[PDB]
Amino acid sequence: HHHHHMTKNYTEAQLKYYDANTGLCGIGIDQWFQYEPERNQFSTAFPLLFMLSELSLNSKEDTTAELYKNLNLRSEDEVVNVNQAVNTNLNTKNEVYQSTLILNAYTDIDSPFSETFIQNFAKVFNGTVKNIDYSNDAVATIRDSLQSDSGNDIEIALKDGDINKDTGIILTAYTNIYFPWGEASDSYRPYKQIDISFTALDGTQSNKQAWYSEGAGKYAEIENLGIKVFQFSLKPGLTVVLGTSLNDNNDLSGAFNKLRDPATLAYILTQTESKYLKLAVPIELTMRDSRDYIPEVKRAGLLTELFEKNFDGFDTVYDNKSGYISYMLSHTRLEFEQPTEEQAASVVAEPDFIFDKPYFFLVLDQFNTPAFIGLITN
Ligand code: NA
Numbered sequence: 001h002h003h004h005h006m007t008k009n010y011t012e013a014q015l016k017y018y019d020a021n022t023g024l025c026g027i028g029i030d031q032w033f034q035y036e037p038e039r040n041q042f043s044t045a046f047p048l049l050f051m052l053s054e055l056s057l058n059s060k061e062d063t064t065a066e067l068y069k070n071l072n073l074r075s076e077d078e079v080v081n082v083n084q085a086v087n088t089n090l091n092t093k094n095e096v097y098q099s100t101l102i103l104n105a106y107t108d109i110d111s112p113f114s115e116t117f118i119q120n121f122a123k124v125f126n127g128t129v130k131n132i133d134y135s136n137d138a139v140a141t142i143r144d145s146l147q148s149d150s151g152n153d154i155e156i157a158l159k160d161g162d163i164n165k166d167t168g169i170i171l172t173a174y175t176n177i178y179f180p181w182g183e184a185s186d187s188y189r190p191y192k193q194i195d196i197s198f199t200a201l202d203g204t205q206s207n208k209q210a211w212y213s214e215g216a217g218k219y220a221e222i223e224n225l226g227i228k229v230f231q232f233s234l235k236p237g238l239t240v241v242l243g244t245s246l247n248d249n250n251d252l253s254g255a256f257n258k259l260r261d262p263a264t265l266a267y268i269l270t271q272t273e274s275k276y277l278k279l280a281v282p283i284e285l286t287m288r289d290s291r292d293y294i295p296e297v298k299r300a301g302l303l304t305e306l307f308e309k310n311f312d313g314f315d316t317v318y319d320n321k322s323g324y325i326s327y328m329l330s331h332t333r334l335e336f337e338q339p340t341e342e343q344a345a346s347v348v349a350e351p352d353f354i355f356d357k358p359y360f361f362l363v364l365d366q367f368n369t370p371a372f373i374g375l376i377t378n
Contacts, residue, residue, distance in 0.1 A: 003092050010077060013078040014086065017086065020049060024049070025045050030260055033377075035299065038201075043289055043372065044175050044372050046086070046101060050103060053124070054120070054127065056071065060313050063314065096235045097179045097234070098177065099176075104172045105172075108131070108132070108133070111323075138167075142163075151176070151333070154288040172328075172330075179235075179238065179335070181336070186216040187233070188215030191343055194210055194349050196208055196282060201250055201358045201377040211280065211285070216274070217275060218232070226254050227245055238364065239368070243360050244360070280355065285338055287334045292328060293329075293330060294327060307325055308324060
């Protein structure tokens with residue numbers, strides 16, 4: 001069991017797909033800071049890519065082309081083979097880290113999916129379809145499934161009333177990832193929680209608990225992006241990046257806009273230089289998120305026709321009609337290993353840097369693409 005599965009025939013395309021993932025994470029945080037500066041939040045883009053990939057196997061020509069442009073993939077062979085590899089990775093558990101990413105497609109009991117869709121969803125993703133009554137307790141059916149299957153009880157993005165007989169295709173994903181810390185003598189780890197003073201984006205002053213953490217890492221002040229960045233490994237292959245503004249004014253928008261370009265993260269990862277890190281970070285080691293991607297995809301100006309009731313661009317999702325996409329749910333639990341009382345006693349909590357204002361994080365795998373991106377503003 002490992003997380004380096006790659007298609008050997010479409011290798012370049014898999015690397016390009018990771019660049020699409022990296023860039024979507026950038027669009028995501030750029031939009032969060034613009035539209036939702038009051039929110040602390042995090043997310044993963046892999047389930048969105050998987051959903052769009054699935055749709056790209058079942059679309060008419062123009063829609064297929066638009067889907068391909070967003071995926072950085074350009075053929076059925078690429079979509080199938082890249083996604084089979086990445087799906088395997090994101091469903092592997094081993095001693096290095098554990099990942100689960102499971103997909104469902106919902107439709108009303110009287111509108112069954114095409115056998116073509118059911119087959120390709122199973123083939124590429126081990127996706128499963130569910131036929132439910134859109135007139136009776138459909139929100140609860142979905143909520144209960146996501147929460148039960150994932151073990152994650154956070155509330156879902158739907159509210160009762162959101163689903164009726166005119167509702168179209170509903171796609172869902174749940175992602176559960178667990179990361180242990182490195183096991184080297186100087187692996188960066190959290191040790192103990194300490195009080196810090198925090199100043200929120202809107203100026204609110206408060207006290208927070210923060211994990212005093214230390215170990216080998218990397219650091220840079222990156223003037224052109226207006227940020228300082230701290231970087232450390234988990235188990236080998238995995239990297240966390242923490243960033244925060246150079247200025248007290250939290251001028252983060254230029255950094256987030258640049259993160260829309262996948263080159264920016266590759267640049268960041270080389271600008272940093274080795275530094276022993278002693279930090280205090282106000283973050284929870286278990287984080288949960290549940291969202292509907294569609295509002296964010298619409299904010300980005302992408303694929304807007306797919307979400308209209310009159311859409312006619314799908315070919316083989318249904319035998320009798322196009323169908324349209326109503327909700328794209330992503331239900332996420334991110335967990336980091338908890339430190340022990342014995343570990344706490346081994347260090348003196350004297351941080352060189354405290355994250356005492358808005359900051360962001362990315363967690364990367366061995367392909368240097370983010371499994372998750374998060375933003376803390378308050
Ligand atoms: Na470097």
